[PDB]
């Protein structure tokens, strides 16, 4: 093929691949956000358990 | 340089950079999957601790 | 427009979009690293709570 057609085809292929990757990145970003939310909730559930365990230790006099 | 050579070089550089980024995205996706698994396990370990703490509170009569 | 100008413009647009995506990927990688650290800490906080709960169960004789 002539070089101009070659180039047009390679550029179009790149445009489609960049679009596909941009959609994947976006999806990974949203997945990360959801995971970050779950980790923040886990941090709070753990802190609550730490306080409940401390209170049980005080009740039974465990140092 | 002539514009056709310029373009061919810029396109090749883009192809290599898009490949490199596609491999990075793929790697980030797999890392996310593994992390999601660890977070699901943490959710279960926390729920189990919540049940064990509740049962201890009942045993000692802690409201 | 002539095809050479067309191509130069499409290539420049691709270069800018690839740069933008590379910066997003990099940012997602660093966010993942920070999240992985928080998950490793959560794993340790959970293990510690499991040991504290086990010790409380032994103290009160709960099987």
Author numbering:
A (entry chain A), B (entry chain A), C (entry chain A): 5 to 67
The paper states:
To tackle these questions experimentally, we designed a set of constructs that had either 6 or 9 residues inserted between two consecutive GCN4 N16V adaptors, based on two different sequence motifs. From Actinobacillus OMP100 we derived the constructs A9 with the full IENKADKAD motif and A6 with the shortened motif IENKAD, as well as the ‘control’ construct A7 with the 7-residue motif IENKKAD. The GCN4 N16V variant can form both dimeric and trimeric coiled coils and was chosen for these constructs to test for the oligomerization specificity of the inserts. All five constructs were resistant to proteolysis by proteinase K, showed typical α-helical CD spectra, did not melt upon heating to 95°C and yielded well-diffracting crystals. The structures of all constructs were trimeric and could be solved by molecular replacement, using the trimeric GCN4 structure as a search model. Apart from A7, which carries a heptad insert, all structures formed β-layers.
α-Helical coiled coils are ubiquitous protein domains, found in a wide range of structural and functional contexts. The structure of coiled coils is understood at a level unrivaled by any other fold. They consist of at least two α-helices, wound into superhelical bundles and held together by a mostly hydrophobic core. The seven positions in a heptad are labeled a – g, where positions a and d are oriented towards the core of the bundle and are thus mostly hydrophobic. We find that they indeed break the α-helices to form short β-strands, which associate into a triangular supersecondary structure we name the β-layer. β-Layers are found, also repetitively, in natural coiled coils, where they form regular fibers with alternating α- and β-structure, a protein fold that has not been described so far.
